[PDB]
Design a protein around this motif. Structure first.
Motif, PDB file in Angstrom:
ATOM      1  N   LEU A 171       3.065   7.348  -2.814  1.00 40.07           N
ATOM      2  CA  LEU A 171       2.332   6.934  -3.999  1.00 40.07           C
ATOM      3  C   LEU A 171       2.849   7.719  -5.194  1.00 40.07           C
ATOM      4  N   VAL A 172       3.075   9.010  -4.993  1.00 36.14           N
ATOM      5  CA  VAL A 172       3.634   9.870  -6.040  1.00 36.14           C
ATOM      6  C   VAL A 172       5.014   9.371  -6.448  1.00 36.14           C
TER       7      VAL A 172
ATOM      8  N   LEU B 258      -0.339  -2.525 -11.562  1.00 38.09           N
ATOM      9  CA  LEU B 258      -1.644  -1.863 -11.501  1.00 38.09           C
ATOM     10  C   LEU B 258      -1.400  -0.362 -11.541  1.00 38.09           C
ATOM     11  N   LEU B 259      -0.426   0.066 -10.764  1.00 37.39           N
ATOM     12  CA  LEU B 259      -0.074   1.456 -10.632  1.00 37.39           C
ATOM     13  C   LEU B 259       0.404   2.081 -11.947  1.00 37.39           C
ATOM     14  N   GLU B 260       1.111   1.298 -12.745  1.00 36.26           N
ATOM     15  CA  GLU B 260       1.623   1.734 -14.044  1.00 36.26           C
ATOM     16  C   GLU B 260       0.524   2.076 -15.059  1.00 36.26           C
ATOM     17  N   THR B 261      -0.682   1.571 -14.855  1.00 35.55           N
ATOM     18  CA  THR B 261      -1.790   1.865 -15.773  1.00 35.55           C
ATOM     19  C   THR B 261      -2.180   3.345 -15.750  1.00 35.55           C
ATOM     20  N   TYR B 262      -1.756   4.054 -14.711  1.00 34.57           N
ATOM     21  CA  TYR B 262      -2.040   5.479 -14.579  1.00 34.57           C
ATOM     22  C   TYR B 262      -1.017   6.376 -15.287  1.00 34.57           C
TER      23      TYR B 262
ATOM     24  N   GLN C  28     -12.660  13.225  -7.638  1.00 34.57           N
ATOM     25  CA  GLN C  28     -12.922  12.021  -8.418  1.00 34.57           C
ATOM     26  C   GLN C  28     -11.995  10.893  -7.954  1.00 34.57           C
ATOM     27  N   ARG C  29     -12.517   9.672  -7.914  1.00 36.37           N
ATOM     28  CA  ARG C  29     -11.735   8.512  -7.470  1.00 36.37           C
ATOM     29  C   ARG C  29     -10.562   8.234  -8.408  1.00 36.37           C
ATOM     30  N   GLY C  30      -9.558   7.543  -7.893  1.00 39.18           N
ATOM     31  CA  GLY C  30      -8.391   7.215  -8.690  1.00 39.18           C
ATOM     32  C   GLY C  30      -7.450   6.252  -8.002  1.00 39.18           C
ATOM     33  N   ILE C  31      -6.164   6.400  -8.290  1.00 40.70           N
ATOM     34  CA  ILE C  31      -5.108   5.518  -7.788  1.00 40.70           C
ATOM     35  C   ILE C  31      -5.108   5.382  -6.267  1.00 40.70           C
ATOM     36  N   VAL C  32      -5.483   6.428  -5.550  1.00 38.38           N
ATOM     37  CA  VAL C  32      -5.484   6.383  -4.089  1.00 38.38           C
ATOM     38  C   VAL C  32      -6.431   5.290  -3.602  1.00 38.38           C
ATOM     39  N   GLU C  33      -7.553   5.133  -4.281  1.00 32.99           N
ATOM     40  CA  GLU C  33      -8.547   4.139  -3.888  1.00 32.99           C
ATOM     41  C   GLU C  33      -8.080   2.727  -4.178  1.00 32.99           C
ATOM     42  N   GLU C  34      -7.097   2.605  -5.054  1.00 33.67           N
ATOM     43  CA  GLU C  34      -6.567   1.303  -5.421  1.00 33.67           C
ATOM     44  C   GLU C  34      -5.294   0.969  -4.642  1.00 33.67           C
ATOM     45  N   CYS C  35      -4.550   1.988  -4.225  1.00 31.56           N
ATOM     46  CA  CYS C  35      -3.254   1.787  -3.556  1.00 31.56           C
ATOM     47  C   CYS C  35      -3.152   2.224  -2.090  1.00 31.56           C
ATOM     48  N   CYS C  36      -4.075   3.040  -1.602  1.00 32.62           N
ATOM     49  CA  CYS C  36      -4.050   3.476  -0.195  1.00 32.62           C
ATOM     50  C   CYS C  36      -5.252   2.900   0.540  1.00 32.62           C
TER      51      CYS C  36
ATOM     52  N   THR D  77       0.857  -1.179   0.000  1.00 34.73           N
ATOM     53  CA  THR D  77       0.000   0.000   0.000  1.00 34.73           C
ATOM     54  C   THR D  77       0.895   1.231   0.000  1.00 34.73           C
ATOM     55  N   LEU D  78       0.397   2.317  -0.576  1.00 31.96           N
ATOM     56  CA  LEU D  78       1.111   3.591  -0.635  1.00 31.96           C
ATOM     57  C   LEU D  78       0.139   4.697  -0.404  1.00 31.96           C
TER      58      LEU D  78
END
Length: 69
Positions: free
Chosen positions: A13-14, A57-61, A41-49, A7-8
């Motif tokens: 995460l940045v 998964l993170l690279e898709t952003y 708006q939802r995003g990477i934080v909801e997937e990684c934090c 988790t980040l």
């Protein structure tokens, strides 16, 4: 496999997004708009934090296409 840092959040995460995409650019919440910042708006934080994620998964952003060829 399990990672102790699966988790980040915040700058962690940045920094990981800067690692997988380079400083060339990435999205966080893929907003594609600049009208205000009153719309979280939802995003990477909801997937990684709020959940766990992998670098993959993170690279898709990334704001650039894959170039592994």
């Amino acid at each position: 496999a399990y990672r102790p840092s699966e988790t980040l959040c915040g700058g962690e995460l940045v920094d990981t997004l800067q690692f997988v995409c380079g400083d060339r650019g990435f999205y966080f919440n893929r907003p594609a708009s600049r009208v205000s910042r009153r719309s979280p708006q939802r995003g990477i934080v909801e997937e990684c934090c709020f959940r766990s994620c992998d670098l993959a998964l993170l690279e898709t952003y990334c704001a650039t296409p894959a170039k592994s060829e």
